Amino acid sequence: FNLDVDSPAEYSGPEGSYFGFAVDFFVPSASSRMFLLVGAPKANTTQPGIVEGGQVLKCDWSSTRRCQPIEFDATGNRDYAKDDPLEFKSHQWFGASVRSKQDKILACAPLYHWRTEMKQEREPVGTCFLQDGTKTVEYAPCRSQDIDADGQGFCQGGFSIDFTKADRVLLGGPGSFYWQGQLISDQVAEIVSKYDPNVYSIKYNNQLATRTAQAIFDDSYLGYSVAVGDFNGDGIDDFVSGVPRAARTLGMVYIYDGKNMSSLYNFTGEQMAAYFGFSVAATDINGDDYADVFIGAPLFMDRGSDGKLQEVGQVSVSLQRASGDFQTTKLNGFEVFARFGSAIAPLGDLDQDGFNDIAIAAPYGGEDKKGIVYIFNGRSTGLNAVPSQILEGQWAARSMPPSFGYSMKGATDIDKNGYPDLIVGAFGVDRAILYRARPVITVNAGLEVYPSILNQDNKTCSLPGTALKVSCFNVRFCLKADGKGVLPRKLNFQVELLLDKLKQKGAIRRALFLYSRSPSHSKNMTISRGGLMQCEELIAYLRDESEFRDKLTPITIFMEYRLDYRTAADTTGLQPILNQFTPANISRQAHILLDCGEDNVCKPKLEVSVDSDQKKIYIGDDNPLTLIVKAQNQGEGAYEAELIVSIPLQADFIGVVRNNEALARLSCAFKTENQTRQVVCDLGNPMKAGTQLLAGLRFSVHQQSEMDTSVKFDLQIQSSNLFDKVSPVVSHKVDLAVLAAVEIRGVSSPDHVFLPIPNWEHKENPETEEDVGPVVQHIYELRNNGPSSFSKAMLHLQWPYKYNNNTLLYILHYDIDGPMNCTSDMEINPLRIKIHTLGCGVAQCLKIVCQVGRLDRGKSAILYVKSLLWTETFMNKENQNHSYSLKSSASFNVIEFPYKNLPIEDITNSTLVTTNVTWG
Amino acid sequence: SDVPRDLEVVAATPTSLLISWDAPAVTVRYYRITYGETGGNSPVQEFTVPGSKSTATISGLKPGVDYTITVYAVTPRGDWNEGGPISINY
Amino acid sequence: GPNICTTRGVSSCQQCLAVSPMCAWCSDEALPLGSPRCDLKENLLKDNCAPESIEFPVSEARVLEDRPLSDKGSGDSSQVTQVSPQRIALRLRPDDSKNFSIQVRQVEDYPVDIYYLMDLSYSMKDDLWSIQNLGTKLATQMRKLTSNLRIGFGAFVDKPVSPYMYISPPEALENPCYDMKTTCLPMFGYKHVLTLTDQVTRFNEEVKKQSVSRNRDAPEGGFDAIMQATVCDEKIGWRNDASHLLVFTTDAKTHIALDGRLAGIVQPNDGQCHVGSDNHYSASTTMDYPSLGLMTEKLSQKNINLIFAVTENVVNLYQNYSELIPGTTVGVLSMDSSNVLQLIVDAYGKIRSKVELEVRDLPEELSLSFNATCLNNEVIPGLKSCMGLKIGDTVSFSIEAKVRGCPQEKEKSFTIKPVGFKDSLIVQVTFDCDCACQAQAEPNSHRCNNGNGTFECGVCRCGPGWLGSQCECSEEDYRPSQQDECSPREGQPVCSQRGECLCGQCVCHSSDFGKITGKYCECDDFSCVRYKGEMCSGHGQCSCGDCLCDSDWTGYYCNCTTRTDTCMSSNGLLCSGRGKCECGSCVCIQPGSYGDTCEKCPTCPDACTFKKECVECKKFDRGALHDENTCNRYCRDEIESVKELKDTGKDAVNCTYKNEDDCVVRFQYYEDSSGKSILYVVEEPECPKG
Numbered sequence A: 001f002n003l004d005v006d007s008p009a010e011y012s013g014p015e016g017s018y019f020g021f022a023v024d025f026f027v028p029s030a031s032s033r034m035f036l037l038v039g040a041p042k043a044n045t046t047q048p049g050i051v052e053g054g055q056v057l058k059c060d061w062s063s064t065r066r067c068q069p070i071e072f073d074a075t076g077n078r079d080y081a082k083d084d085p086l087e088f089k090s091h092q093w094f095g096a097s098v099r100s101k102q103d104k105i106l107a108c109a110p111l112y113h114w115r116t117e118m119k120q121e122r123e124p125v126g127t128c129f130l131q132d133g134t135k136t137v138e139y140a141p142c143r144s145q146d147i148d149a150d151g152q153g154f155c156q157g158g159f160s161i162d163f164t165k166a167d168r169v170l171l172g173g174p175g176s177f178y179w180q181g182q183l184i185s186d187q188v189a190e191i192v193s194k195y196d197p198n199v200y201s202i203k204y205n206n207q208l209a210t211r212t213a214q215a216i217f218d219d220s221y222l223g224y225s226v227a228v229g230d231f232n233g234d235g236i237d238d239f240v241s242g243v244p245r246a247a248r249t250l251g252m253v254y255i256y257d258g259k260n261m262s263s264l265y266n267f268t269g270e271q272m273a274a275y276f277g278f279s280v281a282a283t284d285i286n287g288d289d290y291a292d293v294f295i296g297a298p299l300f301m302d303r304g305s306d307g308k309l310q311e312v313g314q315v316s317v318s319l320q321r322a323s324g325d326f327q328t329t330k331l332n333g334f335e336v337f338a339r340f341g342s343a344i345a346p347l348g349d350l351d352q353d354g355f356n357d358i359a360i361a362a363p364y365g366g367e368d369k370k371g372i373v374y375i376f377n378g379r380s381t382g383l384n385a386v387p388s389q390i391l392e393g394q395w396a397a398r399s400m401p402p403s404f405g406y407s408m409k410g411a412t413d414i415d416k417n418g419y420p421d422l423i424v425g426a427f428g429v430d431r432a433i434l435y436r437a438r439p440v441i442t443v444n445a446g447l448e449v450y451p452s453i454l455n456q457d458n459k460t461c462s463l464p465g466t467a468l469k470v471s472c473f474n475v476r477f478c479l480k481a482d483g484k485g486v487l488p489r490k491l492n493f494q495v496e497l498l499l500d501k502l503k504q505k506g507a508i509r510r511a512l513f514l515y516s517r518s519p520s521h522s523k524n525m526t527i528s529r530g531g532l533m534q535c536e537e538l539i540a541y542l543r544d545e546s547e548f549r550d551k552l553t554p555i556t557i558f559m560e561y562r563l564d565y566r567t568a569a570d571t572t573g574l575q576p577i578l579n580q581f582t583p584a585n586i587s588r589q590a591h592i593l594l595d596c597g598e599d600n601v602c603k604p605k606l607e608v609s610v611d612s613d614q615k616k617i618y619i620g621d622d623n624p625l626t627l628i629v630k631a632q633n634q635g636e637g638a639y640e641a642e643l644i645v646s647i648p649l650q651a652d653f654i655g656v657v658r659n660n661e662a663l664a665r666l667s668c669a670f671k672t673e674n675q676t677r678q679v680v681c682d683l684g685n686p687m688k689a690g691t692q693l694l695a696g697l698r699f700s701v702h703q704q705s706e707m708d709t710s711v712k713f714d715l716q717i718q719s720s721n722l723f724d725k726v727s728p729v730v731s732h733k734v735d736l737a738v739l740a741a742v743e744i745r746g747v748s749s750p751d752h753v754f755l756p757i758p759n760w761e762h763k764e765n766p767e768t769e770e771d772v773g774p775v776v777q778h779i780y781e782l783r784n785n786g787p788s789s790f791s792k793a794m795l796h797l798q799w800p801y802k803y804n805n806n807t808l809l810y811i812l813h814y815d816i817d818g819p820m821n822c823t824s825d826m827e828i829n830p831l832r833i834k835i836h837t838l839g840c841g842v843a844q845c846l847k848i849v850c851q852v853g854r855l856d857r858g859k860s861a862i863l864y865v866k867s868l869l870w871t872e873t874f875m876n877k878e879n880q881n882h883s884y885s886l887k888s889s890a891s892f893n894v895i896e897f898p899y900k901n902l903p904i905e906d907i908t909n910s911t912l913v914t915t916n917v918t919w920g
Numbered sequence B: 001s002d003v004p005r006d007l008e009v010v011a012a013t014p015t016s017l018l019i020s021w022d023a024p025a026v027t028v029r030y031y032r033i034t035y036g037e038t039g040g041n042s043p044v045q046e047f048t049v050p051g052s053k054s055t056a057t058i059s060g061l062k063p064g065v066d067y068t069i070t071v072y073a074v075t076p077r078g079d080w081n082e083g084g085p086i087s088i089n090y
Numbered sequence C: 001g002p003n004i005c006t007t008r009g010v011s012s013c014q015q016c017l018a019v020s021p022m023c024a025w026c027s028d029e030a031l032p033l034g035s036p037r038c039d040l041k042e043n044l045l046k047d048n049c050a051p052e053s054i055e056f057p058v059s060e061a062r063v064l065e066d067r068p069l070s071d072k073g074s075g076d077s078s079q080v081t082q083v084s085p086q087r088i089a090l091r092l093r094p095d096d097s098k099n100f101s102i103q104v105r106q107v108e109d110y111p112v113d114i115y116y117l118m119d120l121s122y123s124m125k126d127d128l129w130s131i132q133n134l135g136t137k138l139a140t141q142m143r144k145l146t147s148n149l150r151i152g153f154g155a156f157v158d159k160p161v162s163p164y165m166y167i168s169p170p171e172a173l174e175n176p177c178y179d180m181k182t183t184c185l186p187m188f189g190y191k192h193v194l195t196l197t198d199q200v201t202r203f204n205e206e207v208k209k210q211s212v213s214r215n216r217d218a219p220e221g222g223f224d225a226i227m228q229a230t231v232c233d234e235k236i237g238w239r240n241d242a243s244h245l246l247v248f249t250t251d252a253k254t255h256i257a258l259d260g261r262l263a264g265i266v267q268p269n270d271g272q273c274h275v276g277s278d279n280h281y282s283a284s285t286t287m288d289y290p291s292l293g294l295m296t297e298k299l300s301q302k303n304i305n306l307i308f309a310v311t312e313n314v315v316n317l318y319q320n321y322s323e324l325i326p327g328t329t330v331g332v333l334s335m336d337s338s339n340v341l342q343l344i345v346d347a348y349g350k351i352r353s354k355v356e357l358e359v360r361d362l363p364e365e366l367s368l369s370f371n372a373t374c375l376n377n378e379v380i381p382g383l384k385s386c387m388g389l390k391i392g393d394t395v396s397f398s399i400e401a402k403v404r405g406c407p408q409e410k411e412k413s414f415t416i417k418p419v420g421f422k423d424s425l426i427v428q429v430t431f432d433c434d435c436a437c438q439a440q441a442e443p444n445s446h447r448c449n450n451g452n453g454t455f456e457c458g459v460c461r462c463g464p465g466w467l468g469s470q471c472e473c474s475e476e477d478y479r480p481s482q483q484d485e486c487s488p489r490e491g492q493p494v495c496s497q498r499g500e501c502l503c504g505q506c507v508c509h510s511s512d513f514g515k516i517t518g519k520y521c522e523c524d525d526f527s528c529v530r531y532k533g534e535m536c537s538g539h540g541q542c543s544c545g546d547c548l549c550d551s552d553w554t555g556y557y558c559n560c561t562t563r564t565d566t567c568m569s570s571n572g573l574l575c576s577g578r579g580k581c582e583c584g585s586c587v588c589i590q591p592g593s594y595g596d597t598c599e600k601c602p603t604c605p606d607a608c609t610f611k612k613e614c615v616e617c618k619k620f621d622r623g624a625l626h627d628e629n630t631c632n633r634y635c636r637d638e639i640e641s642v643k644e645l646k647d648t649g650k651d652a653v654n655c656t657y658k659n660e661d662d663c664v665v666r667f668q669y670y671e672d673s674s675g676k677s678i679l680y681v682v683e684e685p686e687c688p689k690g
């Protein structure tokens, strides 16, 4: 929120040269001046016979605003033979990748082509040039003896580049191995020490590189983007690369070990063609000293209010925990076709609040589709999803979109103001903009009134105009402000004082300043940075007694303060900015003495009473929890009376009750400021004598830890009086209860088997599943619908195996689904066959007993039983033409709950499944 | 190694050819067959066969005038990459 | 009497109308102070004010034209008008609503022009052969469904630039297939060859004149071709009065947007047509591939139906791609393109099987509600579409339009239209907020002469501090305790204290943390309820006690959506017909069913019990599902009476049941992968003998 959009640094290269396609800082150790590195592909150079070779210009902050191209190659095409070039170098897009460590500059040409030195070809291998001081080497790891598309010929190395913490580059190329992609990592010293101008294919020691994979991984574009950061405990920066076309164009992001190039973690986009992985970045966004992942999907389509798809793009924010897998949240875009996640750029700690901040840019959104850059501040809880500042493109769209924000770079303090700054490139208008951060000043102001209670008959001070004693009081406004970075010693604050802010344009004033004789006043103040909370005084003479008829209305003293733009730095127009979320004003209230007894002080007796309409609160779901509050003041008036409702972590307060007349409305607001959650309700200012008020507050509880017996609610009344200002804190609790609606269901598939079986013959010893009979399938489901869950339960199955020493339903096999184990008291499928009412009573009984694990609300346990109707036993002699109803029952018993130290006391039910065989 | 090693003629009755190659080790996407007119101005022509079929048929030749037949194997990579042109003269 | 308008409502003529749609204002040409100021026209009328001085605008849903739904849309007089009505005039007062209806019909014979977009990479050489006479073969099949047919052809390979294009050796530029020892033509981005014409032999003439090219990377850019064939309607010749079908035939993967950065192409695709007189997509090398969103937008605007005709190896890729482009259908294409002639007819059936309304240029100040009537008389609330229809059916939709407040936006109109159709329902919305008596405007000094006041519609609101009909209301010891009207109930506090009573008008003080309004300072902002700690869930304005939910939000807390897309299952039915859809979440009704769309019910009866209800009403013409006339809507399965219950049990279920004739019927249920489900029925069931 502290970026200056008024006077930024504008830079412009030649038109048509994509000036700004890639930007970075340059902070050499050899000097104190810091520079800008702006790549410019498609730029015509002095290279002989090379058209649009591309440049990387060095722009300075010396206020001359002049960019000088950096000499990297300066030579034309080397020759494989006479009139047979080895390289082509034209339209090579040199400068599309620019990244710089302390004193070294790395630029690449992803569209550089090669002759391959074996046959006559033009393969976009890509090349890079690493420059350190005067020496300049060529780093082309993809220019090797692996030639064709199955090799590295189309790799386009240098498409995305980066440095690690200790002198090691991370290079990506999307065209290796039929466009599978590749990551190549090399030591900076190895790149310089092993360079040989007479060797085109150089092998480096300690080169980490990904290898070719199965053909199903083709056309994945690994190495499209690169980011570095530590994701294990090794301390070495690991490799992060986006794979936008991976997994059927779902998009993936790979994380390789920065030590032995082994897979560490993964990410996958939820939507196809969203280009999940177009942009990646790694930063500690929560101050945890653990790097967090950021992934851009510019073409992600979300759902609007209507529900139709709209392309707004989303950014994947993954917080790394010290234990393992990340905590991933989503951040959708704002405008359609804006491509919100096209560029993700970390910028140090922008506001210097102790947590790093990041910037996400939509190059094609905003007014006239000029481009928007959003700034997101980090917090203790992670990344704040609400943007704090928007940066708008300022240039036209002559030929192509300006693409303001297509490339960004931060986390470097180009001036000495102590705050990191940001570079934004356009490349559509061939321009780059530098935004400098402004210092942040956190200011707190106090307001006091001597005294807070006024007596009209107690006139002491003399009016300046005519000598008459007037009732008076004092008001003091102290002001202290400080901040970090470079900001001036003394700050110019302009403060305004307003007496009786409540009454306004049409009303009585009731209070004016002593000398000015006016209800308002202004003061020019000037304080110092560290401490020294300066104050001033003008004293508040009260109006003539018994002249306004309006008492019981508190005279609210209101102070608002601004900051004059006078004091700034030598930065030529970079003025500070106050803290983001800080009150620009503060109010105090005085009261006229009225009905405070013969002691001239109002001593009330506040009381809180709450009964329990609700009795039980069930674990596992939200539920209405209404509390009835009875606030009464038996005593003299209580100034600024408020009801303080301290709530637990599970409260989630919502609204107040309106539908009753026995309890009236109230003015309540949820707020948490200092280490505690609570609900404050206004009880009248002042809350006069008697005043028995009834009200209700609604809550929906999300229980905690599954072991708590109750939930805590402490209530009391507070006031501004000097004596007996509060009420006895009254606590009310409601017990957590366990309720679990568990049901058991069953069904037969099919529920009918007509006789005779078509095309059936009897084998005396069959193993067919066909010579036995039709397949009868019983499915039993134990489902827990109730809010509370249970940890252990027992299920008993009764199966009519035989009847008069012959089989009824030969069970082939049974399967389980969910947290359950089962065991049959008789061996299932003993014959190794491979693919009126007869119950488990009068007939032979086969039991299957099961143990059930933890079942929550949305989960159940299912037992599939595939059996065979033994056709031999039916239809033969004793059961020739008779209707039999094969009956199987199943009962369950819940025996344990995870909520120990709480009443449970039972759960049990049962059901039965029937399979009727009939004749005709 | 990306080439089948087979395809000597089978079923030489009609004014056609029935050739049969044998299982290249690498996965095969398609098969390409060319034919015609060894020593003349070469009216060459082709047709496509899916990689699961190991046989093909040709048409439109003279009464056994000793054509030349070639077969290609198509890699499942890129748009259309191939190689290994095994040939026979029949 | 005092319902809502008499008290808490009397501010001015324009504010009286904004309180409730039932309020009314009067200018009675006299001064019977009383309370005939702003009141219901059943009470204000009894207050003896009706020389047409009553201002009570009524919300109007008048139709401006409604042509009858035609029967056959080919040939004769004019104006097929497959949508009725066409233009209606909506007139709404603040915070009011009216409702209307719309009927759409798939005409019996509607002209169809189909454009063949074909991949010409080397894997399609076999396909280009068998498509030689499939132009006239497609003529005879489409002649049955449509008498007026048009066909056109288009070609695409990929972007002709590295790394996609064979750039070297120079010996292979006119012949990108050089190592193959054959000859192909140089590759092209998109090539339009034959414009839409009614000569089916002309199609076969341009075919076999085309030849096949070669590319280097497997993803072939056809989205460039799809985008151009859609927005170059002038070049290719889309009939503005015919059904547009664009068939996309390819066997490999496709390039998506942002893939062109490898080739150095960083300019986003624009929805503009760039195919020139050379019939080649000129911007192919300079412009990136189009995204799904931009393709969806222009596909809907040009009313083009995109048909994906791809092979089984890549059909699942285009299945998921089509899910992101609603209204498009995918079909299995044989390796040699021998199935395209049948696949086109099958796709046109699916396209004409559904009707879904789309809204364009809708002002966000008003929201639309939908009750759909797809079946005979059964209404489906919340739905704006109908599924499972045959050509000739007619469906109905009822729509309600409600406004939050009322703007002065100059009566902008909007469109309601089914997707892919030319005919549409245009709604002209008008807002009548202000009163007709404001035109006179009676500026300052008529009855509030000095201390400049005003006069408007029979009342005076005089200056900053003076108040009431009579005036000066001044800021000094002027001391009325007003009475009994600054508070109701005869004994309540003074003006429900936020600001006190000064001369009775209750100038509400303590204006902070929101504004305080209302005649007794009764109203305010920020006084609504919370759901997750956010007031009205952030989805509704707070109007003095209550949330005015934004568009597509309903309920007291405005936390209930009107979206039915999250309720939609994969088969098409919302919640699989096993439960209702409330606030975008299903609530299953069938016992033992659960899940997001109630798709999981392991304890439900098998398919034998469900599918036998069709074989009863379809084959025996009786039983349930017949008396409701819903037999041949829910029963889309192919049924054929056969014998012996054949052997092929790849994935099938044999089902036996006893009908009311006390006979045993046996049938089967089979399906091809991701296709249709057919029903075999054994003829001559078993009945009791003798």
Ligand SMILES: *[C@@H]1O[C@H](CO)[C@@H](O[C@@H]2O[C@H](CO)[C@@H](O[C@@H]3O[C@H](CO[C@@H]4O[C@H](CO)[C@@H](O[C@H]5O[C@H](CO)[C@@H](O)[C@H](O)[C@@H]5O)[C@H](O)[C@@H]4O)[C@@H](O)[C@H](O[C@H]4O[C@H](CO)[C@@H](O)[C@H](O)[C@@H]4O)[C@@H]3O)[C@H](O)[C@H]2NC(C)=O)[C@H](O)[C@H]1NC(C)=O
Residues within 6 Å of the ligand: A212, A213, A214, A217, A263, A264, A265, A266
């Ligand atoms: C994040 O996502 C990444 C993206 O998927 C994950 O990377 C992937 O991890 C997979 C699991 O390790 C890995 O699958 C393994 O691949 C290797 C490849 O080596 C092969 O060596 C052979 C000779 O060169 C060839 O494979 C033969 O066999 C395969 C069948 O497996 C045939 O299809 C081939 O035609 C060929 O005949 C290949 O050329 C290839 O170079 C395999 O060796 C592994 O085999 C393992 O499984 C078999 C049983 O199926 C075991 O017998 C054997 O001992 C191995 O354990 C795996 O198939 C993917 O290749 C890899 N992909 C990429 C792009 O990196 C990453 O793991 C994930 N990380 C996390 C943390 O989630």
Ligand SMILES: *[C@@H]1O[C@H](CO)[C@@H](O[C@@H]2O[C@H](CO)[C@@H](O[C@@H]3O[C@H](CO)[C@@H](O)[C@H](O)[C@@H]3O)[C@H](O)[C@H]2NC(C)=O)[C@H](O)[C@H]1NC(C)=O
Residues within 6 Å of the ligand: A621, A622, A623, A624, A625, A654, A698, A699, A700, C530, C531, C557, C559, C560, C561, C583
């Ligand atoms: C929008 O917000 C309101 C208020 O926060 C929600 O109202 C609550 O809705 C539930 C049902 O969803 C009501 O029923 C309560 O939940 C249990 C669950 O088992 C039910 O069995 C009981 O009947 C119980 O009353 C609840 O009373 C109601 N009010 C509360 C919690 O204060 C509403 O559900 C929200 N809507 C959406 C779509 O989020």
Ligand SMILES: *[C@@H]1O[C@H](CO)[C@@H](O[C@@H]2O[C@H](CO)[C@@H](O)[C@H](O)[C@H]2NC(C)=O)[C@H](O)[C@H]1NC(C)=O
Residues within 6 Å of the ligand: A015, A016, A017, A042, A043, A044, A051, A052
């Ligand atoms: C770099 O110089 C080349 C010189 O060829 C420029 O290319 C020519 O640009 C003009 C107008 O833009 C065209 O009419 C010519 O056809 C181009 N030449 C060729 C061979 O096509 C190029 O525009 C220059 N680029 C920059 C950024 O200055």
Ligand SMILES: *[C@@H]1O[C@H](CO)[C@@H](O[C@@H]2O[C@H](CO)[C@@H](O)[C@H](O)[C@H]2NC(C)=O)[C@H](O)[C@H]1NC(C)=O
Residues within 6 Å of the ligand: A450, A451, A455, A458, A459, A460, A461, A471, A472, A473, A474
């Ligand atoms: C009567 O009024 C005087 C003056 O307004 C009060 O004396 C002030 O007391 C406050 C602290 O309570 C001091 O900050 C002021 O400086 C005092 N003003 C003076 C001394 O002029 C006094 O407290 C009031 N009440 C009495 C006298 O009972």
Ligand SMILES: *[C@@H]1O[C@H](CO)[C@@H](O[C@@H]2O[C@H](CO)[C@@H](O)[C@H](O)[C@H]2NC(C)=O)[C@H](O)[C@H]1NC(C)=O
Residues within 6 Å of the ligand: A819, A820, A821, A851, A852, A853, A854
């Ligand atoms: C089902 O049987 C398993 C095997 O004995 C029980 O043990 C679980 O799984 C492994 C053994 O493979 C143990 O090391 C775990 O400690 C067990 N897990 C849990 C959650 O207890 C398992 O407990 C049995 N489950 C039930 C419901 O009876």
Ligand SMILES: *[C@@H]1O[C@H](CO)[C@@H](O[C@@H]2O[C@H](CO)[C@@H](O)[C@H](O)[C@H]2NC(C)=O)[C@H](O)[C@H]1NC(C)=O
Residues within 6 Å of the ligand: C099, C369, C370, C371, C381, C398, C399, C400
């Ligand atoms: C769609 O049908 C529903 C059916 O309920 C209509 O709902 C209205 O709102 C009340 C509130 O419950 C219902 O009880 C009534 O049936 C309806 N009110 C009436 C008819 O005055 C809804 O209005 C219908 N919408 C449209 C656009 O027709």
Ligand SMILES: *[C@@H]1O[C@H](CO)[C@@H](O[C@@H]2O[C@H](CO)[C@@H](O)[C@H](O)[C@H]2NC(C)=O)[C@H](O)[C@H]1NC(C)=O
Residues within 6 Å of the ligand: A758, A759, C644, C645, C646, C647, C648, C649, C650, C651, C652, C653, C654
């Ligand atoms: C459904 O029909 C019969 C069940 O009676 C099964 O019959 C098989 O297929 C044919 C047709 O009857 C015959 O060859 C035999 O009766 C059976 N096959 C063999 C090899 O014996 C048929 O399989 C059943 N199909 C399903 C899916 O249940």
Ligand SMILES: *[C@@H]1O[C@H](CO)[C@@H](O)[C@H](O)[C@H]1NC(C)=O
Residues within 6 Å of the ligand: A234, A257, A259, A260, A262
């Ligand atoms: C790679 O990562 C670390 C080496 O620092 C080690 O813990 C791990 O086992 C290594 N694995 C392989 C396969 O090299």
Ligand SMILES: *[C@@H]1O[C@H](CO)[C@@H](O)[C@H](O)[C@H]1NC(C)=O
Residues within 6 Å of the ligand: A560, A583, A584, A585, C512
């Ligand atoms: C005073 O600060 C509050 C926030 O604390 C802000 O809402 C208000 O606009 C400021 N100015 C006033 C009350 O004049």
Ligand SMILES: *[C@@H]1O[C@H](CO)[C@@H](O)[C@H](O)[C@H]1NC(C)=O
Residues within 6 Å of the ligand: A751, A752, A885, A914, A915, A916
């Ligand atoms: C089987 O017969 C019993 C007899 O009481 C009946 O209750 C049950 O519903 C029948 N099962 C069927 C028809 O599936």
Ligand SMILES: *[C@@H]1O[C@H](CO)[C@@H](O)[C@H](O)[C@H]1NC(C)=O
Residues within 6 Å of the ligand: A907, A908, A909, A910
């Ligand atoms: C068992 O379930 C039935 C309903 O299926 C219910 O009426 C009965 O009260 C339940 N009994 C127990 C002990 O859960």
Ligand SMILES: *[C@@H]1O[C@H](CO)[C@@H](O)[C@H](O)[C@H]1NC(C)=O
Residues within 6 Å of the ligand: C098, C099, C100, C101, C398
């Ligand atoms: C609104 O109700 C139905 C549809 O819901 C509609 O047909 C009818 O004309 C409307 N009624 C009124 C009174 O506007």
Ligand SMILES: *[C@@H]1O[C@H](CO)[C@@H](O)[C@H](O)[C@H]1NC(C)=O
Residues within 6 Å of the ligand: A248, C316, C317, C319, C320
């Ligand atoms: C298509 O989507 C479905 C679910 O959305 C998924 O199961 C399937 O794997 C997807 N197919 C492909 C090829 O991605």
Ligand SMILES: [Mn+2]
Residues within 6 Å of the ligand: A229, A230, A231, A232, A233, A234, A235, A236, A237, A238, A258
């Ligand atoms: Mn590491």
Ligand SMILES: [Mn+2]
Residues within 6 Å of the ligand: A283, A284, A285, A286, A287, A288, A289, A290, A291, A292, A319, A320
């Ligand atoms: Mn972190």
Ligand SMILES: [Mn+2]
Residues within 6 Å of the ligand: A349, A350, A351, A352, A353, A354, A355, A356, A357, A377, A378
């Ligand atoms: Mn920060």
